[PDB]
Design goal:
monomer, 1 helix, 56 residues, Ubiquitin-like (UB roll), 43% strand, globular, 4-stranded mixed β-sheet, alpha+beta
């Protein structure tokens, strides 16, 4: 399934998507991606829209 991440970091902004077997797996992908790009923020996830957000 496609999952989406909305980025609202201090300097990293925009959107990315990933193909994952479940939301827990997508969460791990996105949190690793955010960490690796220096984003340390607050997270939401909406299971109806398959969308994660991270905000600094």
């Amino acid at each position: 399934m496609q999952y989406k991440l909305i980025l609202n970091g201090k300097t990293l902004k925009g959107e990315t998507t990933t193909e994952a077997v479940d939301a827990a797996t997508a969460e791990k992908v996105f949190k690793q991606y955010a960490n690796d790009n220096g984003v340390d923020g607050e997270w939401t996830y909406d299971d109806a829209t398959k969308t994660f957000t991270v905000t600094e």
